[PDB]
A = this chain, B = another copy of it.
Amino acid sequence: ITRPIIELSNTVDKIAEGNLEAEVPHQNRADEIGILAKSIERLRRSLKV
């Protein structure tokens, strides 16, 4: 749980700095980390568009 959350926190920081190309990890987990990851991916795509 701890490491993936740190990782996704990192991912959100890169998106904030304008890097809309960095891959979002953990999109395929079957739990709540998975759901958070799918959210961040959708956010990433929404900002590209």
| A30 sits at the interface (CB 8 A) | no
* Count of this chain's copies in the oligomeric assembly: 2
Q: Note all chain B residues with C-beta closer than 8 A to A13.
A: 39, 42-43
A 1-44 contacts with B by CB, 8 A:
1-2, 5-6, 8-10, 12-13, 15-17, 32-33, 35-36, 39-40, 42-43
Is the Cβ of A32 less than 8 Å from the Cβ of B16? no
- The chain A residues found within 8 Å of chain B, CB to CB, are 1-2, 5-6, 8-10, 12-13, 15-17, 32-33, 35-36, 39-40, 42-43, 46-47
Q: Which 8 A-B pairs have the closest CB atoms?
A: A16-B43, A12-B39, A5-B32, A9-B36, A16-B46, A9-B39, A9-B35, A2-B32
